[PDB]
Each structure stands twice: as C-alpha cells, then as structure tokens.
Design a protein around this ligand. Structure first.
Ligand SMILES: [Ca+2]
Length: 448
C-alpha cells in the first residue's frame, strides 16, 4: 500500500523517469516530488529554481517534452508526480530565464508591475507580530505577487490545470506562509478536481501566521516533527517518543507531511544543527526507521546530494545514471531513498498500513524502544552501547521472519537475503540487536 513519497532534489527528468522504472516503482514509493519545472533565472545555485520568470516548462531539469515523458513513464510504473509550485512570488531584480525570456523591474512576460504588491521588506520581527508584512512584503527581495488579483489567480490556476492535464497528480505550494489562506482558497476554487496538495508552512510556534490556518486547503508541512525527532535522537531518550505526534503539540496526523529533513532545513533554513541528515550516517538510518515505522503523518523521504558544506552549491555535474553506471552513495548523489534501512522502512510502512495503531510499546526507559503495528508488524531500535537482548511481546503469528531492514524475502518466500527474526509460539521475540542497529518485520515477509 502506498504510504511514502520521496523528494529527488535537483534530479533532472531523465534520471527521475529511469529511477521510477528501475527502483521507485518496484520498491513501493507512492510518488515523487520534483524540483520546480517552470522557467527560472540562470545560475548554478540550487535556489535559482525558486525564482520564476514564466510558467513554460523549460528548466534546469529539462524541457517540456522531457518533462512529459517523465510523468508518463513514472505513471506506468505506479508512481505519481508532485510539482513544487511557486505561488507567492516571481524572480528578483532583472535578468534572463532558462527559456530565453527577459524580465526586469517587476516586468515579466506574464506579469506587470501592477500584478505585484507594493515593495516592502519582510523583517525577522515581522513574523512574530505583523501577518500583514509577512504576506504582503517581499521575502528576501522576491517580487511578491498579488495573490488576491483575479488575473494572478487565473494564471497560476491555469499553470496547475495544465500540469494536471499532462498527468501531474500533486502539488507543493512553496512559501505558503507568505500567502493569505483566503487567497489560497480562492486559487483552489479555480483548480480542476481535487489533486493532492500540501503546503510548505514553517511554524515552530509563536508566529503571527499559524500553520493551522492552512489545514483547510490541503496538507501542511510539520517542521516540528523534524526538529523534535532530531533533538530527541541527539540529546534525549527515545523512550520519550512513546506519545510522539499530537501529544507533543503537533498538528493532526492526517494533515501533516513529516520528514527527517528537507532541502531547506538541511542547510540551516528552518532547523538548527539538531536536525539529522545523511552526514550522520547510522543516526540517519535509525531516525528514518522510526519515522517510517511510526503511524504519524505522510512521510517524505529525502534524497539529496553531497554539497561539501557550500549551502549555495547546486547539484552534481553528472547524471544519476551515467551510461549504465549509478552515481550513488559517494561524493555526488547520496540516494538515501536507496539505503537499505530507509527502503526497508518504506517496506514496513506499506505492509502495516492496515493497522495505524502502536501496540505493545516497550522501552528500557532510555534509548532502547520497541513497538508493533498489531499483528501486521513489529520493530525495535537499539541506541545504547550494549546489545538489546530483551524479550518483547508481539501480536504476530509465530514463525521465521526476514529483518526487512537488512534484506528481503525471496520470490518463493523460502529465504531471506539478510538476518532472520523468530517469533516464538507465545508471540514474543528474544531480541539480539547490537549497538546502534534496528530490526523490523511484517506479515508479508514470512518464510516458507
Ligand atoms: Ca506574499
């Protein structure tokens, strides 16, 4: 059952189309969030993608034809496409777009100086006590579109309706905090049907504009999850997560889009150092295993590239698929969605989606937790410096199960590629997990 989606940051349409057929489809990913496909400014920095010139599908990821080929090829594989949409602004200053268009002085090929809000600057303090300035002034200098204008709302909605016709099935509304929820509701009245849409709102609390103001127009990104999960795994006790979710002040599970990190907060935008990324290796594995196993939110697995510190640097200068050679796990693309632990976690979630309850919770009161998803699956994480050799109780049928985190079940279901977990006649399991490791089993990965 589809339950997870991945974000292939800066991946071009070619790589995404291939990745769909070769891995994403077969593994179980529901869909893919792609980088803005519309025309943007020229430059190698990743953030150039967030400075639109027009809405013609000519970006750094490829052209219209290529984009279309990508949507189609993924659909056949069983993978939807989510398009990161810019609804709050347009490029800044003056220049040229990736499709050859010119712009300058709030004058684009499809917008005039009158289609924008009068120029003013958004200040750090404005977020706390001035929703007006937050949604009407310029964010980092980006021309702020007049989202209340019928003309503006029509051109954006036309862009969205085109991508739907092409087959896009979801949308990410970027910088939704900088756009009045009222304007978003108007926009959606012009959008055909009801495509999956989630809004990027960064609300850690104490802000003029609350995340809750958008629960009505679609899902919302819950940044608390990220910083809290990271902070717990780094400086707290995993035993605290027993009631993670609404109990910690988080928005409703069925409204939240959670994740361990994203392209922003992994660069210091929306999260401090406590956030966990691919650079933390095994820590990232464990953290991801928790997220995918825990029945809260719609998980967004991250797929990034090593930027060697430079937070402005763009993606690698080599495709993920280099003449039959996969450029992953090294100094270019990290392809975390392919890491055994993370993919294994995706598998767990997919086969336990028929029991969104956390059962038989157990913990050593500190950094060894364990719980199940009813008789559909069970997991355990050991973050201590000694082996977890405790006997836990499960609701799973006795037998031999594959630890889907370290391997998978064979075709004939008569073997596992990784280690085998045993559930005794009484439904218990005599754990045997080394320091900083984990296990996870489900009903669709049973032997013989
Ligand atoms: Ca705005």
């Amino acid at each position: 059952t589809p339950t997870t989606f991945v974000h292939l940051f800066e991946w071009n349409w070619q790589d995404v189309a291939q990745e769909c057929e070769q891995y994403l489809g077969p593994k179980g990913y529901a869909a893919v969030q792609v980088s803005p496909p519309n025309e943007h400014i020229t430059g190698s920095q990743w953030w150039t993608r967030y400075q639109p010139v027009s809405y013609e599908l000519q970006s750094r990821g490829g052209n219209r034809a290529q984009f279309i080929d990508m949507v189609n090829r993924c659909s056949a594989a069983g993978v939807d496409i989510y398009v990161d949409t810019l609804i709050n602004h347009m490029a800044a200053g003056s220049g040229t777009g990736t499709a050859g268009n010119s712009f300058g002085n709030k004058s684009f090929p499809i917008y005039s100086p009158q289609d924008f809000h009068e120029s003013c600057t958004i200040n750090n303090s404005d977020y706390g006590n001035d929703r007006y300035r937050v949604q009407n002034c310029e964010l980092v200098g980006l021309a702020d579109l007049d989202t209340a204008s019928n003309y503006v709302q029509n051109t954006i909605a036309a862009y969205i309706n085109d991508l739907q016709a092409i087959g896009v099935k979801g949308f990410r509304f970027d910088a939704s905090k900088h756009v009045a929820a009222s304007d978003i509701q108007s926009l959606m009245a012009k959008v055909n049907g009801s495509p999956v849409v989630f809004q990027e709102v960064i609300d850690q609390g104490g802000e003029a504009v609350g995340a809750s103001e958008y629960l009505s127009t679609g899902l919302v990104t819950e940044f608390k999850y990220s910083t809290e999960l990271g902070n717990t795994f780094r400086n707290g006790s995993l035993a605290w997560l027993s009631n993670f979710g609404e109990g910690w002040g988080f928005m409703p599970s069925s409204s939240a889009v959670v994740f361990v990190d994203n392209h922003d907060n992994q660069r210091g935008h929306g999260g401090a150092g406590n956030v966990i990324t691919f650079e933390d290796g095994r820590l990232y594995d464990l953290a991801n295993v928790f997220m995918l196993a825990y029945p809260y939110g719609y998980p967004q697995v991250m797929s990034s590239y090593d930027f060697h510190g430079d937070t402005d640097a763009g993606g690698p200068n080599v495709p993920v698929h280099n003449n039959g050679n996969l450029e992953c796990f090294a100094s270019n693309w990290k392809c975390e969605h392919r890491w055994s632990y993370i993919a294994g976690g995706v598998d767990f979630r997919n086969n336990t989606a028929d029991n969104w309850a956390v059962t038989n919770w157990w913990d050593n009161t500190n950094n060894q937790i364990s719980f199940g998803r009813g008789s559909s699956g069970h997991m355990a994480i050991n973050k201590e410096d000694s082996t977890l050799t405790a006997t836990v109780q499960t609701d799973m049928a006795s037998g031999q199960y594959c630890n889907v985190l370290k391997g998978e079940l064979s075709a004939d279901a008569k073997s596992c590629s990784g280690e085998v977990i045993t559930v005794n006649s009484d439904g218990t399991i005599n754990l045997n997990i080394g320091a900083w490791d984990a296990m996870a089993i489900h009903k669709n990965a049973k032997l013989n």
